[PDB]
Amino acid sequence: TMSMYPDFLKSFLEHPSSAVFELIEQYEATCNTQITLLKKIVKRVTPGQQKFSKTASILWLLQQEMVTWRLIAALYRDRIQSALEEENMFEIAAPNASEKTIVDKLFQRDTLVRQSQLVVDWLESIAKDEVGDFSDNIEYYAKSVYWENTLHTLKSELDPDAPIRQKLPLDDLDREDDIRLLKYLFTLIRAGMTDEAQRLCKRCGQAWRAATLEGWKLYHDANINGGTELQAVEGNPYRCVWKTCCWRMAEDEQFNKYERAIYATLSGNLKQLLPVCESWEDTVWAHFKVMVDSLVEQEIRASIISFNEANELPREYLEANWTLDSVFEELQATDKKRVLEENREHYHIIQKFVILADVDGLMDEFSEWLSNGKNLLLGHLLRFMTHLLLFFRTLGLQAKEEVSVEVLKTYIQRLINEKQIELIAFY
Amino acid sequence: CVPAQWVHEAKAIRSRRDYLLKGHQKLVTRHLAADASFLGELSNPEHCKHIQLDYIRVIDMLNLIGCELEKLHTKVMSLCYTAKDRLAQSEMAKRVANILQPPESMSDS
Amino acid sequence: IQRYVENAQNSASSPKSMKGFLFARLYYEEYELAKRSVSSYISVQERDPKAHRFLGQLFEIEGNVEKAVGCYKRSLELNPTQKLTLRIAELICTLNRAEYWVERASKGSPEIYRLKEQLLSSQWNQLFDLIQAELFDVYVNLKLVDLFLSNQRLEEAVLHCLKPERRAL
Amino acid sequence: LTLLLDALPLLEQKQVIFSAEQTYELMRCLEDRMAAKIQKQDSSIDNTKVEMLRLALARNLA
Amino acid sequence: LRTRIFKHHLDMGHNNQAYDALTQIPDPSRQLDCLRQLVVVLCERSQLQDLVEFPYVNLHNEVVGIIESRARAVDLMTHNYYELLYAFHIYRHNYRKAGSVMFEYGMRLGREVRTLRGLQKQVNSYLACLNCLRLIRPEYAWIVQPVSGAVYERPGASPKRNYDGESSAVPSSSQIEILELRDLEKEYVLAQTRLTLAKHNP
Amino acid sequence: AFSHWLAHTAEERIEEEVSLYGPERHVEAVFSFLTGISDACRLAQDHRLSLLLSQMVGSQEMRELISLQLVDWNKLQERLRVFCLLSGTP
């Protein structure tokens, strides 16, 4: 595993002969392979299992290195590549164009909001799903029909509205079974696994819950909205009513905690008990989702797309949007007024800096820590900044030459210590 | 006892049994609401600054006293109880002072 | 698009900044009339960065820098989305608070460092330093040595003209 | 009670004074009955009562 | 000429019925004091039905400042009980909040001079305050001093926070809403018990 | 033009009638407010049903899906009638 310095610098050897972007993609892949070796093969029994978990956490640093390279690649590919330069055709619209064409336009025109979406797509890519068929969440929740226990045992109407309508009905077993469903649908919604959430809602027998998921999509008619001509019309033309109805349904108690939370994620609002177990990536996702859902609605309002009748609960919804900067600052604080331990992590601070777009600010600032005798403790962090700077200058002439020399010099000194003579000498 | 920053921890526990400054050495907002004295409030504001609720801090600064934005923030604070009513009255008084004025009139409206 | 302006006219009659703004959008798709519509919409309420900039651009080119400050000041302090910046600082410079605004603007924006120096030049050693700071590009180095010439620094200027001059030729 | 209010309106309720105090007691009794066991309508009666008080004030001014 | 018009109009009192001319003085400039002294002489003429109908024509911003200035003058401690009721009618037109506070101020003065036959009047005053509270159900209103001549500010109703315990020595009698109204109800029950004990003596 | 026209026609009849209906009891009314949407939803405030109700006035191919699926679910086990309306073939 000492031959890890080879794999990154081997990705360097191919790059004088070839092209820039595959270097970052290979850095994602190289770190990904290294996660697996450290992670595998480790067996934990009793007390050691904890030791194995600690080992995984250390590798966990390599996992974080893979996720960070993926994010770096995704954002720089949007920012530098010709994907931000195109005809304004997506934004050429008329009042008769549907609310969906208006969202397609907003995402094309607003690069800043679209960058938030690329971060969301990344956070969804690295989400933890519970298992279907190898955990009690869905394997043991394979009940043939919905509310079989409450139907078979008394203790009037099958519909989900019957227990919101009146007190006590549901059997404890059916509530326990619903907890597993909604938790698993909720993990899938966080993972962006919307199609799987719909497939499960249909197969579990929950056609009503499936219908709520369908109301994500805005109305598109292919006939009127010729830009994205599909074949059938799709989505719901009163999305604001649907958003408010979903928000109201989220607030209502006597529903499961996981259900209220899916409705909160759909409404672009926060949830409460489920966020107690929300990690940094998970909290970043929920808060960016609020920012996207508020921004889209404000553009829809400014365009005059929304109808006054659909405004059932304006007073209950946050009209304001926070900036990406405030998103990270609020997420960075702990609930107990401490620096968040996850935010303070050396590679997580970089993820945020790549999202803000001030990458080069930390690259100069980090180099100052080397002269001040800091960073040396984390063996990965010194390497990371080296490869990251090398990648920045190849894609765009960016980081200061002074910083490149200081970072490369300290990195080459390490190659002699690790005795990587052919590569260290070259650096 | 061997030096550690355990003095604040012990002092805080004693206060709970029977204060805010000792804790410093949501709740702060509640304290401000109770204190809808002035020097103590200033000290609390300084502590908040050291900690840095930002909107609440801005409101406190306004009370101690771009302008339109500040007025909007004050309105938001008013939007979000007898103590609350008193705070609203104080905000109205502040608006009157500001008027003493089209923006002020709008705030009054 | 004519049906769309009928439904806009009717809505306005019924009650409506977003109608009046929409009319402006239709106009963008008879500029004086559109500008008038934008002005009315702005008066009714404050909405979208595209509203604020269409009115503020109309007033800016009408020469009415007091109306353009009014829009852009409300669009900043309302908190909808201010990043007008040119007309505000420029307006302050024309007027001859302003220093604070300049500092805020400064907080690698070149023309902004330039307008800042010129404000300081209406409100000598500090001025000389300003040029030295900017210079730390041949034409930078050349205006730097020319205004050193003005302040009276013959020894420094000939070294820092010649240094440039055989960095460029 | 509604009939009494109508009579006061016909009269203008100059001297009722006690009745407004009396009316409050009746309202309290109604609340007690509710506790033992139309809100808009109840508000209207209060408004009608206020008119009598205003008339009494006018009489005092006279 | 205009300073003569004030002096001359005041002395006659009869031509000082010129309300639209009264309203035409505050709108140009801060000569509100001319309206304040002149409308007092019109109150001395004392045709309150007609007199109060003309401040419907006068602008409400001016009417609030003139009627509040008049209401502070109504705290004259006069036997003119009606001036409080006509102030209550102007408060009825506005937010109504101050009519309740003016009633407690008038109750306090009526308690201070003498007792006994004032008990039945205090019952009527409790009925008036209870009716005024029912009219103004969601909104709060604060008292300052026991009437006009105020040298206290507004301590509020949300500053229940102390400092050290020496800053909780403020009288805290700004918050004379629903809680003190329940204490006035206790005063009424004490009066009822005293009267029932008094009826069992002969 | 016809929609609103139809409403006005079925007015007074749905007017004072549905009035009492509400100020009375019980179900069905939920269906009757749908014949009259946002005020009916606000009065009703069944969170999942509320989101499906906003698809009414939508001619979208939502019909069939929700239609058959909900019916099947009920078979396996004032709500079926709402689904019949969103099927578009009531």
UniProtKB/Swiss-Prot annotation, chain D:
Subcellular locations according to the entry: Nucleus, Nuclear pore complex; Nucleus membrane
Domain of life (superkingdom): Eukaryota
Paired cysteines (S-S): none
Similarity comment: Belongs to the nucleoporin Nup85 family.
Function: Component of the nuclear pore complex (NPC) that seems to be required for NPC assembly and maintenance. Involved in nephrogenesis.
Quaternary context: Component of the nuclear pore complex (NPC).
Protein name: Nuclear pore complex protein Nup85
Residues of the full protein shown: 573 to 642 of 653
